[PDB]
Every structure is written in structure tokens, then in C-alpha cells.
Amino acid sequence: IEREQHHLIESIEKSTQYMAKRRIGALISVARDTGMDDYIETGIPLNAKISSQLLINIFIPNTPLHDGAVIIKGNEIASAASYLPLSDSPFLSKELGTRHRAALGISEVTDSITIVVSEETGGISLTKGGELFRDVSEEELHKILLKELVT
Template sequence: MFFGQDLQFFSLLGQAIDILLVAFVVYKLITVIRGTRAVQLVKGITVILLVWFLSSFFGLRTLQFIMSQLVTYGLLAIIIIFQPELRRALEQLGRGRLFQRAGDQEEEDALKTIEAIIKSVRYMAKRRIGALISIENETGMNDYIETGIPMNAKVTQELLINVFIPNTPLHDGAVIMRSNEISAAACYLPLSENPFISKELGTRHRAALGISEVTDCLTIAVSEETGGISVTKNGDLHRDLDEETLRRMLETQLLGESKSAPAPRWNWGGRKNG
């Protein structure tokens, strides 16, 4: 009796594991094809399977025959037409990225964002192109995003540089980033009213300080006059930063304190993990 119950338990456990594994694989496949042409393919296959089921249920033999032929030869057509997407999925599977955790993907995206910011800031600093980049943290910045031009674009070095090129429509104002994306450009930020700010600082640095006084964002300012790189956070201004220090600040902001290298010169809370 107990032996039979044990067999039944292991059978149910095996079925549960089987269902969970299939669900996990399907979920990962959906994440791979999301944003590609394959999404439309999945919709088309769903329609064909639905028509095939209905034709079988209602006894529509001619329609059922046509749907059967589509399913039979459609698999070969799918492999030929969507070869790039299938190759990308197999490459990700070979690199182990298909089954990586969501947290690992978020960290990878954050590192790409940091690298794009570093390269763009380096380029603009060398050529003395003024720039103002705010990275949202816990405090929402919707009020300031609405003052600019919506972009909702992936952060890239080329896009950031192009935004701040002089005499272009978006160069005057700040870029506001959220979740590794550029939410808006040409945004207006509040100017700091601190009377102890150095007179040599212009409007761009006053705006960087002003937004840091009312939110917990991190703001990068590149000076047109000197090419110096400054960062503001929690009302503090850090001037003439080198690339390594800027990288550590960005890692603290986007990855959190635990994943960034220690830096004794500054100590402020980064984005909370999870």
C-alpha cells in the first residue's frame, strides 16, 4: 500500500517538474523572440492552429486538409525564413545566456549603459562639448521629463553624443535616463539657489546641483569652457573627475554599493538591488 502511494507521489512530482520545465523553456523562448519578426510568426501559427482545431471539431474536411498541409510544410518554411532568429537563439544557448537569471541580464544591461556613458562623456570632454545627463534613482523625475522631448531610446554612445552636438535641436537642456534608457532630452532642470556656489560655475552646473537638491538622481555635467567632468548627488558637487572615479560613481548608482569598487572620497547610497 505504501509502495503504491510512493509511486503515485513520484509520478505526480515528475509531472509537476515536467510542466515547470516546459513552462520555463517556453518563457525563455518568448524572451528571445520578443521584439523580432518572430512575434508575428507566432501569432500566425496560433491562428492556423486555432482554425485547424475548429475545422476538426466541426468536421470541415476540406479546410482541415488545407490546414494539415500548412502545418506539415510550414515547419520547413519557418526554418528557412527565420534562420537569423533561430541562429541567435542557438548562439545564446551555446553561451549560456538563454537560461541566465533576470538579475544577471539587468546587471549586463547596466554595465553596457555605464560603458556607453563613459565613452560619450570622454568624447565630449576632449572636444569641450557641453553636456548634462541625469540618471533617475528612487525619486521619480516625471515632472522634469515632461519638460523635454520624449525619446524612450536605448542608451548608446552615438546617441548621447549626437544629442549634445552644438546647434542641434536637442543640445540645449538635459538628458534624463531611466532604467538604462533615455527617457527624454532637452529637459529643463531647476537651478540651485545655493549662495555659496562658485561664481565660475555656469548655468549647466547650477542645474546639475539644483536637481540633486530635490531628487536623489546622479547628474553628470561636462563643461564647455574647460572640458572638465563634474558629478552632483544629494546636493554635493564633485569636480574634475577622472574616468575611473566616474565609472565607480556610475556603478554605485546603477549596480548598487555591493557591486561597485570602494571609493573613500564619496559616500552616498546607490540604487537598491532587487
């Protein structure tokens, strides 16, 4: 139980660090108490073991799986290329793309934690409860993943 949360955070940090250094857009939504069943159906069901290697391969550009969101439920990568609700927020910075707006929209209707990697800048962002934390350091990302994903 404790080890599953450790691997999940490590898999997220390693994968996003890889993609951030290569300007690879990413969109990983980790479900919590709410339940994102209807949003898992919108993509390709994987029900896969969580690994940093698989997360990297999913968001590779011009691939069948990169256009959408990875949804992590339980101890599995539930699906890839899934579609999340888009937030109509006017406060989200105009220079942020569809990935950030979809990450913001899912945080407004679920208690899930969502991670974003900008394909334009390589910055990492987080969304929770209708708010976005932009361009986080590895230390900031680690603290928030601990606070939100560890029970």
C-alpha cells in the same frame, strides 16, 4: 539586469569622454528611486535605446536637443533638452555655468545621479544629494558610477 547597468555606465563614460575632449557641454541626469516624471515632460521625449553614439549626437552644439538635460529612466533615454531645477547655492563656484547649477538643483530634490561636461574646460562633474564633485578623473567617475548606479 547586470548587463543593463554595465552598458549604461559604459555608454556614459564613452560619451562624456568624447565630449570632454571637444569642450562639448553635456547634462545627463540618471534617475533612481525618486522618479523625475515631471522633468521628462519639459523636453523632447525620446524613449530611446541607450547608446554612446546617441548621447554624443544629442549634445552637439547649435542643435535642437543640446539646450537642456538628457534624462535616463529605466533602460531608456527618456528625453533630451529637458529642464532641471536651478540651485540657489552660493557655494557652487562662480565659474560654473547653467549646466552645473541645473545638475546641482536636481540633486537637491531627487536622489538621481547627474553627470556634467563643461563646454569651457572639458572637465567632468557629478552631483548627488545637493553636492557637486568637480573635475573628476576617468577612474573617479567610474568608481562613483559603480557605487551609485549598480544595485
